[PDB]
């Protein structure tokens, strides 16, 4: 119960109005960013006034950047005197199953990892405010990982337009758009530096062999409908072959003992497939409904089994 | 094989480009190395390191030594190129056995409109160990190295044997053969005698313009005619990949054309095979960067005195001498230099550079030897030893035996080969002394030899019978009137357990960084000699000698 559960206890103060206190009874399946793993904390360390720096509360793209400096935890039960949350990383429960709540507009599936994202969507940024205490609780949004990478991708691309539309998405035929918002340039700089260092290190000498195969793909996309759909209608490589004639050098330095493409894959995987984990946080949570259904709708709870 | 691949990767740094250069893949034979003073067994004990530098025609400085790659094969070298052997299946390609040696591609100094100066020298070095006795240096001329024309002609018939050998080898292996191999056999047979590498050496053929060789045929075959009125290579490339399990790029060029040009080594009279692959970026390769090597300098220099029936360009009239100068501004150096450090437009001129230095060093002794010994002296002893009553009778023999040795030293010192002389303790003191006015090569000098004038170097000589040099490695001893002595920090030489002049049957000779000589006879009786006074050399010679025999310090 130290290893199985871990009851990190957020204390509730004395003076809270009964309309504000009963507003916390609808805060069941949430995500609370614990700074440490103390067994006794306060709402001020949980609320957004803990998140704010000196004079500056950052934007949504920066609001990711101190989630991953903290410990996400899910509220287990809202008592009148305290709020109990088990941290995700240490131990889930006795049996190891906690319930979240879809504050998403998006329906989940079983077995898919669930990433939690700041409130970026339109008509969605709902922060339960304590009027009796002047505290806001910016509850993040649990999302599917095929969305939660694109939503980070639209925000990072929006900041780099602003250094010289984009905020519209789709998911299973549901049109949805996120909040267009001005971004602090200090937040964009650590993001853009995190792109390039994972992009420069992802290039190896054997990748020039792969580059030669680009006109073979357009020779292949004229016959395979799978390749014709794979590239895109607006892909770069379809445009990067009509102006580009790639070639490989003849010999390799010590090219007898080393593998050109096998070294190309491992350096690619360690930096380019790894790159989505560095932008967002890791989806350490998936949903395994035991007996309910295969699709978990919005507003409903969902059972959670930890995710390696 | 791989030694040429690895070097071309180095030549891909285009070097600078500001000074244009080229590269020539060379296969030295073993018998050319054997005659070069190279023990063959020592190399066998998979690349090998070699230092190279280029040396100017007449006057100038040599390139600083640079490390290249070498791989020695104690087998047929040309055969390994020609008939690569699958590790799993040896019997796939039968071939004629031959000899071989290391593979080194060599740099070639080019120009804008690249033309090599013949008689200019490129140099190797071979280190079997730290000390200079384990180091040899071989020389080559751009005339020697660069053949006028290549041959891809004789290599053509070779490939059809492969298409026959694969088709023949699979037919034996039959059912056991992997299906992909049997497949390629079908096509390769539709495209359709052991392999002897020495054919391509003696083959009378090479590449040609062949333009009029097409038009010769159409005015031939119409004569005649009017009287009347997936390549195979990819299957071969898939032939190995069936029986190999890997691409093995070393083999891929072996399946292509291979240009084998037989050459001869002016030094050893022996043979070394220049090779240029088909895809090779170096000289002779079908893929090469312009400008390429031209004979413009060389061809004229032959007919300049040939049309004059003259042996030497300096016996050529200065009118024709200036004639080629107008075309070729680089020939000023050898022709117009008043006192060329090297005899211009010669071959052995470089050797004359060495041998005169040999003489220059000797007289720096005999005149200095005569100096201190001139009027009959009393040497006493600069060392410390105790003598027994019976040992005195021995010392009595040292008196009578004393003058004969002093002859025999300078006898042998003169008699030494000029090459090997430069490994001796005295030649190292010179290369150390002139350097003092760097690190002499082979690191023969101890690190503290530059500390005090007390640090010395030594050789030993047999007192009885033939007088010889008993010490490969010059021995370093520090001295401190009498003062004791001690060795320095570090196969076995029994001569090294003794101090100089400590025992009978050792003549102990030494020098200094200051180059103040010391001659130590048995019994410890020894006198100083300062040979720096009588040593006389030109600074342009001294600086040119060092850059060959020493290295820029680390």
From Swiss-Prot, chain A:
GO cellular component, one term: viral capsid
Main location: virion
Keywords linked to the UniProt accession: Capsid protein, Host nucleus, Virion
GO molecular function, one term: structural molecule activity
Pfam families recorded: Herpes_V23 (PF01802)
Cell compartments where the protein resides: Virion; Host nucleus
Subunit structure: Interacts with TRX1 and major capisd protein/MCP.
Role played: Structural component of the T=16 icosahedral capsid. The capsid is composed of pentamers and hexamers of major capsid protein/MCP, which are linked together by heterotrimers called triplexes. These triplexes are formed by a single molecule of triplex protein 1/TRX1 and two copies of triplex protein 2/TRX2. Additionally, TRX1 is required for efficient transport of TRX2 to the nucleus, which is the site of capsid assembly.
Family assignment from sequence similarity: Belongs to the herpesviridae TRX2 protein family.
Protein's name according to its UniProt entry: Triplex capsid protein 2
Organism listed in the record: Human herpesvirus 2 (strain HG52)
Gene label: TRX2
